[PDB]
């Protein structure tokens, strides 16, 4: 089997992407944030504290003839950025772009933090990291991909995120029309539960490539590109007037600037992030200070190849017995 679904930016800055997902019978369609950096499929629901719902579409298990309470199971997740959610668990039928999994754990939120409430466009998360990070207790549950894997034509999914435009998540096949040149594959460590890999270096603008190993995660649920302070400083040093602002929370730059590209290495291959992809617009409405899309990972504890980086590529998440990651230009 295969599946193919369009993923759409939630706003004009590509702060996140939503993908429609069919849950239950008859189908209830929710727009979920596909997240290769976490491993829980959780949704706003009829059980969510009313004051914490503000415009989201909810899953109502009592209206699904295929929903079953997973007795005794609870879940609770605290994301790196301080957001959180928790609740109980149903199993139900979940379909993504024509690909159907029966008995998928659908984690129903009883509580969500303010960041989730305030984002009316995101109805929940669909985790695509390794199932070892799943938070359901006392019986850990599998991700949608893990459940689908054996049925797929090939045990892969691909992320093709758009810049200020829709893109695609495919399951079970590689669309050879969706990228240019070749796909370069690189090793993955699953030791921390992530799609963790090592970039071979970077360049700033038309500058020379610096060969250096940068370990990090391919994380569709993170907006920005988080890299070591040395690398980030070298980037922003090429933008007149750029500075790191503790008050704002990272590097800012004059909105009148033209940003240089940023290149990252995948083996001997190179992925070029155009300068425009690194512009996250005014820090507040009407400001002439703009927020940067490349930020320091210092004090995160891990480097993160988030949407800024991934949207410059066609990315293969290869879930074979020994997983790997593939990157192509597009």
Curated annotation (Swiss-Prot):
A single BP term in Gene Ontology: proteolysis
Q: Which family does it belong to?
A: Belongs to the peptidase A1 family.
Q: Which gene encodes it?
A: EAPA
Q: What is the lineage of its organism?
A: Eukaryota, Fungi, Dikarya, Ascomycota, Pezizomycotina
Q: Name one GO molecular function term.
A: aspartic-type endopeptidase activity
Per the record, what are the reactions this protein catalyses?
A: Hydrolysis of proteins with specificity similar to that of pepsin A, prefers hydrophobic residues at P1 and P1', but does not cleave 14-Ala-|-Leu-15 in the B chain of insulin or Z-Glu-Tyr. Clots milk
| Source organism, top-level taxon | Eukaryota
- The identity of this protein, by name, is Endothiapepsin
- Active site (UniProt): 35, 199
* Disulphide bond pairs: 255-290
Keywords in alphabetical order: Aspartyl protease, Disulfide bond, Hydrolase, Protease, Signal, Zymogen
Report the EC code(s) recorded for this entry. 3.4.23.22
Q: Which residues form the Peptidase A1 domain?
A: 17-328
